[PDB]
Amino acid sequence: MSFSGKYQLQSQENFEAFMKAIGLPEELIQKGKDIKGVSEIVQNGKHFKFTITAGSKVIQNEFTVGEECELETMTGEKVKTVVQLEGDNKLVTTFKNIKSVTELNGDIITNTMTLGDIVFKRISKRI
Numbered sequence: 752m753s754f755s756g757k758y759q760l761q762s763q764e765n766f767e768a769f770m771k772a773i774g775l776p777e778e779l780i781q782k783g784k785d786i787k788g789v790s791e792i793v794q795n796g797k798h799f800k801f802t803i804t805a806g807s808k809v810i811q812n813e814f815t816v817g818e819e820c821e822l823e824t825m826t827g828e829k830v831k832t833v834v835q836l837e838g839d840n841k842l843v844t845t846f847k848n849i850k851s852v853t854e855l856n857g858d859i860i861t862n863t864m865t866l867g868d869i870v871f872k873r874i875s876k877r878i
C-alpha cells in the first residue's frame with residue numbers, strides 16, 4: 752500500500768498546546784493555528800519524500816525506512832532518528848521526546864504526535 756499523494760488538513764486537535772510545549776513564539780501559533788494547507792508524500796518503496804505544511808511553516812523530510820535520517824523540526828533544527836514501517840499503513844518514529852505515528856486508511860491520513868500528555872492529532876484527506 753502506498754502513501755503517495757497530496758493531502759489537505761481536515762481538522763486538528765491540540766495545535767496550540769503542542770506548539771506551546773515545543774517553544775513556538777505565540778505569534779507563530781496564532782498565525783498558524785487555523786491554516787489548512789496541503790501536505791505532499793512521494794513514496795518510492797522504502798524511500799519517502801515529505802513536503803509538509805505545518806501551521807505557517809513548510810517542512811521537508813526525505814528518508815528511507817529503517818535507515819538513519821534527519822527530520823526537520825518546527826524550530827528549524829535537524830534531529831537524527833529512524834522511521835519505521837509498522838504494517839503496511841503506519842509510519843512510526845521518535846524525536847525530541849515526541850512519539851509520532853502516521854497512519855493511512857484509504858484516503859485519510861491520521862498523524863498523531865505525542866509529547867508528554869499532549870496528543871497533537873491531525874487528520875488529512877487525499878485530494
Ligand SMILES: CC(C)(C)c1nc(-c2c(NC(=O)C3=C(C(=O)O)CCC3)sc3c2CCCC3)no1
Nearest residue numbers: 758790801803805812824825853860862873875
Ligand atoms: C510523517 C513524518 C515523516 C514522520 C513526519 N511528520 C512530521 C510533521 C507533521 N506531519 C503532518 O502533518 C503530515 C500530514 C498532514 O498534514 O496531516 C500528512 C503526512 C504528515 S506535522 C508537524 C511535523 C513535525 C513538527 C511539528 C509539526 N515530521 O515528520
